[PDB]
C-alpha cells in the first residue's frame, strides 16, 4: 500500500536492518518506480547479484511512466524545486495514491503523503 524510494532498497541490499523494518512496516503489494528499478539494478551488476536482485524486485509492483506521470512530474518539479527523478517518483506515488517512503528529508520535507522511516 506504499511506494518505496531507491535509497531504502539500496540500504536493504546493503544489509541495513533499518531498511528491513521499513518494508515490514508496510503491507505487501508494495510498489516502486521503474526508475528505482533501474537505479537498483545498476548496483546489482556492480556487485554481481543481478539475477537474485531481479527476483526480489519482481515482488514489487513496478510502475512504468505513463504520460499522466510525465505531466505531473513536470508540474511537481517547479512547485517543489525538485530534481526530475525525484519528481517522477513523487508523481508516481500521487497518481496511484500511495505514500512515498524515503530517507530524503532534505528535498521532501513539508510535502504531504511522504514518510521518512529512519535516518541513521
Amino acid at each position: 500500500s506504499a511506494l518505496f524510494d531507491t535509497n531504502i532498497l539500496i540500504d536493504l541490499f546493503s544489509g541495513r536492518r533499518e531498511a528491513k523494518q521499513a518494508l515490514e512496516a508496510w503491507p505487501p503489494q508494495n510498489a516502486i518506480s521503474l526508475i528505482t528499478w533501474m537505479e537498483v539494478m545498476v548496483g546489482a551488476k556492480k556487485y554481481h547479484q543481478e539475477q537474485r536482485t531481479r527476483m526480489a524486485l519482481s515482488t514489487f509492483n513496478i510502475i512504468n511512466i505513463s504520460q499522466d506521470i510525465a505531466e505531473r512530474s513536470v508540474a511537481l518539479r517547479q512547485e517543489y524545486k525538485l530534481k526530475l527523478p525525484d519528481a517522477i517518483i513523487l508523481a508516481t506515488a500521487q497518481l496511484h495514491r500511495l505514500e512515498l517512503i524515503t530517507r530524503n528529508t532534505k528535498d521532501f520535507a513539508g510535502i504531504p503523503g511522504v514518510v521518512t522511516p529512519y535516518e541513521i
Binding site: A19, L23, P28, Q29, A44, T53
Partner: peptide
C-alpha cells in the same frame, strides 16, 4: 460456518511472510 473468517486470516499471513522471506533474503544480498 464462518470459517469464512480464519481462511481470511490465512491467506492474510502469509501474505506478509513470503514478504518477510523476500525481505530477509534480500537483506545484505550484495
Amino acid at each position: 460456518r464462518a470459517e469464512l473468517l480464519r481462511e481470511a486470516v490465512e491467506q492474510y499471513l502469509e501474505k506478509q511472510d513470503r514478504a518477510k522471506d523476500t525481505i530477509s533474503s534480500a537483506l545484505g544480498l550484495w
